[PDB]
Amino acid sequence: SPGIWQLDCTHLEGKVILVAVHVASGYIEAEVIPAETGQETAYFLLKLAGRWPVKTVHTDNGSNFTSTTVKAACWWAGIKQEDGIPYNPQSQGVIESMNKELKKIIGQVRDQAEHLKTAVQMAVFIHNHKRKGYSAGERIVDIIATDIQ
Amino acid sequence: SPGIWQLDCTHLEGKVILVAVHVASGYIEAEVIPAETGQETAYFLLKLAGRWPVKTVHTDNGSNFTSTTVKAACWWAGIKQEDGIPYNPQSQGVIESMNKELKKIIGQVRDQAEHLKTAVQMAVFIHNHKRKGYSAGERIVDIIATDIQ
């Protein structure tokens, strides 16, 4: 549970926003890329896994699941790559609602930066610090610390 | 001290590696940029502060300390920007030895990627997971959890 992340890819302004969600906490990391390739996905996972103890990633589609670049990066970083199949049918909705919520925050901050990437990082900040009582950022830290002990 | 970070800029292959160190733990985040500008520094701090509860940043030089772009991002993210003067002189040496250690890891992984940025993320991963007994990644999480509770 403390090690499980879901990949999610969403679109805005003709660009792609790649998101990793820590499932148990709702904490997120995100980046803007011109399009989702195996190489961009591989690099984003490498970044993520040097920052958090990533044990399992539920990939966002079959092309990243198949990608030899993604597989090489998951091997390198000690990540088990799984499918993102929502056997739990409530997962489709949780991700859709997160995408909708992130896009709302981005629109709330959009005018405070020229570049999309900046507004996306502002939205990451607001999402992770929002108390819901603990924030997503407090929850992930608590979950992993508990796991270390 | 759970909220205290130090900025550090080092050079390799004609590029710049911008590093943020969590002082209490030795945990690091890093990125490759073509050169250290206020805008790059401001963006890197915004990413960092959305991911960890950053209270104070000891800036790496006076140009970033002075930079209106850096000050606007520190304001935006709730960060107190401080100077990075080693009033405690053991601070210069710890940073130097960190840059030397990072560069050694980068050369050990260097052949495992074409792009410098990839090797830097590999080095961040190895640095943060090296158990020294806990890793830097375990120490940062323990420090911050204790602070929430």
Ligand SMILES: CC[C@H](C)NC(=O)c1ccccc1C[N@@H+](C)Cc1ccc2c(c1C(=O)O)OCO2
């Ligand atoms: C040179 C003029 C710039 C483009 N300013 C604006 O247009 C502008 C427009 C509105 C509000 C603020 C700004 C100020 N801005 C610098 C915030 C910023 C900092 C760092 C970054 C950014 C950006 C960004 O704007 O996206 O992008 C990646 O690193």
Ligand SMILES: CC[C@H](C)NC(=O)c1ccccc1C[N@@H+](C)Cc1ccc2c(c1C(=O)O)OCO2
């Ligand atoms: C996990 C690394 C694996 C074990 N190494 C190799 O397969 C390897 C080794 C040497 C040369 C090329 C490669 C292949 N290459 C595509 C790696 C890679 C992935 C993602 C990226 C990259 C790069 C990069 O090469 O820099 O740049 C930004 O996003």
Ligand SMILES: [Cl-]
């Ligand atoms: Cl800003």
